[PDB]
Amino acid sequence: TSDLIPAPPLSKVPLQQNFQDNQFQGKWYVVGLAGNAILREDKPQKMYATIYELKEDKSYNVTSVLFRKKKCDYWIRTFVPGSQPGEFTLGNIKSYPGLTSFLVRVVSTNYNQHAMVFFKKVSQNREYFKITLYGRTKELTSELKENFIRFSKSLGLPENHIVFPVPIDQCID
Numbered sequence: 001t002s003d004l005i006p007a008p009p010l011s012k013v014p015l016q017q018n019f020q021d022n023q024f025q026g027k028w029y030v031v032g033l034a035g036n037a038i039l040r041e042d043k044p045q046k047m048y049a050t051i052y053e054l055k056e057d058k059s060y061n062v063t064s065v066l067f068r069k070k071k072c073d074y075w076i077r078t079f080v081p082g083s084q085p086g087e088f089t090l091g092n093i094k095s096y097p098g099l100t101s102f103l104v105r106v107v108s109t110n111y112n113q114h115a116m117v118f119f120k121k122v123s124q125n126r127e128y129f130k131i132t133l134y135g136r137t138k139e140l141t142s143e144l145k146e147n148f149i150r151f152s153k154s155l156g157l158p159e160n161h162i163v164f165p166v167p168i169d170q171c172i173d
C-alpha cells in the first residue's frame with residue numbers, strides 16, 4: 001500500500017553550528033530537491049523560490065512562489081524556532097489535516113551563496129523526509145551540487161530521488 005525509503009536517524013543529519021537567523025533571511029532559489037517522496041520525471045520540475053522573513057518575534061514567515069498552470073501560486077507558512085538554533089517547527093501544525101509531526105533543520109550554509117535544509121514529517125502515519133539545496137542565485141557550482149548529491153546518497157536516496165529544478169523567469173523574481 002506504500003513503500004518508502006526509511007527516514008534517516010537524525011544523527012546522520014548535521015546541524016549548522018551557531019546558526020545566525022539574521023544572515024539566513026531573504027529569498028532562496030530551490031536549486032536542488034531530494035527525498036523519499038521526490039521522483040525525477042523526465043517528461044522536469046520548474047524552479048521555484050522561497051522567501052524567509054525574519055519577523056520581530058524571531059519566527060520566519062516562509063512564502064514559497066511557484067509558476068503553475070499558468071499562474072503565480074503563493075504558499076505562505078510559519079516556521080517557529082525549535083530546541084536549538086537552526087531548527088524549526090511548523091506554526092499552526094494542528095490546522096494541517098493528517099500532519100502529526102514536522103521538523104526543519106538547517107544542515108549547512110554560508111548564508112550568502114548556498115544552504116542545505118533538512119525536512120522531516122509524519123503524514124497519515126507515514127514518515128517522509130526531504131533535503132533542499134538552496135541558492136541565492138538561480139544557479140550554483142558543480143562543487144555545491146555534487147556535495148548535495150553526496151549528502152543525499154548518505155541518507156539513503158538514490159539518483160532518481162534527486163532532482164534539479166529547471167531555472168525559469170516567471171514569478172520567482
Ligand SMILES: O=C(N[C@@H](CO)C(=O)O)c1cccc(O)c1O
Pocket residue numbers: 035037038119120121128129130
Ligand atoms: O516530500 C516532501 N515534499 C514534496 C511534496 O510531497 C515536495 O515536492 O517538496 C516533503 C517531505 C518531508 C518534509 C516536507 O516538509 C516535505 O515537503
Ligand code: NA
Pocket residue numbers: 050064132
Ligand atoms: Na522550500
